[PDB]
């Protein structure tokens, strides 16, 4: 089929990094499907000496979606380059399991960052404001490059060095039934399985929400089969403590039901660059 | 639904029995539960609050396939919570757990495998083999694929009765005798089948091949199958003919019914039926 294709064409030079050169460490993080492990990888990419990365695998219970998931991650990640989306430095195709080299960055996931930090970790409204742009500077280039993110969470951002921001976790993203968590996803993601870059704006609107609350549960004590209802009647989170009035204005903007109204990245990037200066 | 909608007040949940990153299961108390009197003990299937679409259908999948099956040899649906709150699934406690989990406790917890409850023999094993068979024959007839038939989806009730479960991915065949899925599967690639794999099929002969998969979970004692392999290099393996060799505990007749499960043509392997047959012969010489 598609996947035993992939596989074959896979494992058949730009991107084939050779397995010797990389030395596995500590687990980064572990689901029942598959793993990260930080690493070191030698002559990497012309780089003098060992170069701290993640690798990306699977585990030996996994499924055909997830095995898909990998070699489609590895596919977009070739075709992006910027400096707030996760850097692909290649891949273990011909020794062994099929591993994705990718940067490390230091201070994990943003959801966990954000949970770790506490009240204005020091973090201040700036800081939290240059956060959002940064994502919505690498959601603006990959909506150039007509990419649907598709999965846009805190989970799947990453906090590198200098609290840089990399968007990461392309196994989902498409060109232009789903397994996205029905919090984050738009109403005609839900009703109509359309995504679109205006789907992964509203998206962005939840990531705000975690970003502002410091990495908490969205729609807390409601289960996913009720948020059906709820959204097609017009009910949306509240604005939450230590939160503006005009960052919520821009989460309302994000949750609108016709996509058409919703703001695109370019006008996102441009209200939060309005946020900083007049602070 | 009047026949499996349950109050809500009178569900109790307790402790964690098994999780995923989807999906959950705790242990439950059921009060008045179909005409019972008082306190019944089950397990109650629940998602959790990252669930997706594929999740919340595939539990609503799982709940109306198990109101049209009933078998000694399938878990029992009581019922399920519906309305104004979480969709919970009530089905029964089985004591031992899954399958893989008790035969992998029989190599540490005593008496063991010898060649009352936690010690288990040959015969035993192929009566676990049997069961699960028995109860793959009735789901064949009702013109369902589980397409996730392997050994942490058995569970092991009081009596060491095996319940097969775990049908979220269980999909109808009445039209085609077939189930064609256009997209990637999210069945394991180490229990799946060669057409499956490849061509995407699932068909009650393509459960057939799993079964031959938990056969060999079964014998080694819970072991993991195709050892030391990625899932990646399985598609090769498959294609040039390469299959599991035969384990240590494994008699010749064993191995040669798991061999017919992984036959490349699916009308090669026998039907269902024709391995409860097998086993039951393989019972009585022993
Ligand atoms: C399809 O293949 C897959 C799919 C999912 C997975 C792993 N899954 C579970 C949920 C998803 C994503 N997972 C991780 C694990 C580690 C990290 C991670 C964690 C991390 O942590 C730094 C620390 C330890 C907090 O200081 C640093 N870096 N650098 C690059 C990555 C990547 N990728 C990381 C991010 N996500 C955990 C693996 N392969
Ligand atoms: C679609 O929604 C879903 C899908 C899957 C799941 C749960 N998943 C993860 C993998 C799959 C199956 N899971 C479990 C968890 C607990 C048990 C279980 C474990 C169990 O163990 C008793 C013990 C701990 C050995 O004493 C007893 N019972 N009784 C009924 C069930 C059921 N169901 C159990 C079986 N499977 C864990 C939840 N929602």
């Given at each position: 089929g598609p996947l035993s294709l992939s596989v074959d064409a896979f494992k058949i030079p730009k991107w084939e990094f050779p397995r010797k050169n990389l030395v596995l460490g500590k687990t980064l993080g572990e689901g029942e499907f598959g793993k990260v492990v930080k690493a070191t990888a030698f002559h990497?990419?012309?780089?003098?000496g060992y170069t701290t990365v993640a690798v990306k695998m699977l585990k030996e219970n996994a499924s055909p979606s997830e095995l898909r998931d990998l070699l489609s991650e590895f596919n977009v990640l070739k075709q992006v380059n910027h400096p707030h989306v996760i850097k692909l430095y290649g891949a273990c195709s011909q020794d062994g399991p099929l591993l994705l080299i990718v940067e490390y960055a230091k201070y994990g996931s943003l959801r966990g960052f954000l949970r770790e930090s506490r009240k204005v970790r020091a973090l201040t409204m700036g800081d939290l404001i240059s956060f959002a742009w940064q994502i919505s500077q690498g959601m603006q280039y990959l909506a150039e490059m007509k990419?649907?993110?598709?999965?846009?969470?805190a989970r799947n951002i990453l906090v590198a060095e200098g609290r840089k921001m990399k968007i990461s976790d392309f196994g989902l993203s498409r060109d232009v039934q789903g397994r996205i968590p029905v919090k984050w996803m738009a109403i005609e993601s839900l009703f109509d399985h359309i995504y679109t870059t205006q789907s992964d704006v509203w998206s962005f609107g939840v990531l705000l929400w975690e970003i502002v609350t410091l990495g908490g549960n969205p729609?807390?004590?409601?289960?996913?089969?009720?948020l059906f209802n709820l959204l097609k009647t017009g009910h949306r989170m509240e604005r939450p403590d230590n939160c503006s009035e005009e960052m919520y204005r821009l989460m309302l903007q994000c949750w609108?039901?016709?996509?058409?109204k919703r703001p695109v990245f370019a006008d996102i990037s441009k209200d939060l660059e309005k946020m900083m200066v007049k602070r």
């Amino acid at each position: 089929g598609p996947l035993s294709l992939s596989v074959d064409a896979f494992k058949i030079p730009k991107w084939e990094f050779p397995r010797k050169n990389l030395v596995l460490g500590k687990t980064l993080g572990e689901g029942e499907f598959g793993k990260v492990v930080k690493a070191t990888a030698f002559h990497l990419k012309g780089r003098a000496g060992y170069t701290t990365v993640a690798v990306k695998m699977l585990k030996e219970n996994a499924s055909p979606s997830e095995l898909r998931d990998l070699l489609s991650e590895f596919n977009v990640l070739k075709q992006v380059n910027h400096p707030h989306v996760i850097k692909l430095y290649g891949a273990c195709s011909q020794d062994g399991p099929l591993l994705l080299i990718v940067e490390y960055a230091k201070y994990g996931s943003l959801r966990g960052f954000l949970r770790e930090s506490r009240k204005v970790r020091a973090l201040t409204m700036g800081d939290l404001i240059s956060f959002a742009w940064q994502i919505s500077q690498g959601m603006q280039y990959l909506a150039e490059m007509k990419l649907v993110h598709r999965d846009l969470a805190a989970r799947n951002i990453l906090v590198a060095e200098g609290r840089k921001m990399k968007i990461s976790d392309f196994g989902l993203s498409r060109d232009v039934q789903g397994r996205i968590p029905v919090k984050w996803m738009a109403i005609e993601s839900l009703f109509d399985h359309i995504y679109t870059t205006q789907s992964d704006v509203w998206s962005f609107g939840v990531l705000l929400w975690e970003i502002v609350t410091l990495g908490g549960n969205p729609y807390p004590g409601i289960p996913p089969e009720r948020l059906f209802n709820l959204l097609k009647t017009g009910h949306r989170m509240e604005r939450p403590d230590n939160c503006s009035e005009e960052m919520y204005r821009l989460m309302l903007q994000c949750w609108k039901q016709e996509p058409d109204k919703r703001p695109v990245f370019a006008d996102i990037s441009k209200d939060l660059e309005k946020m900083m200066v007049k602070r």
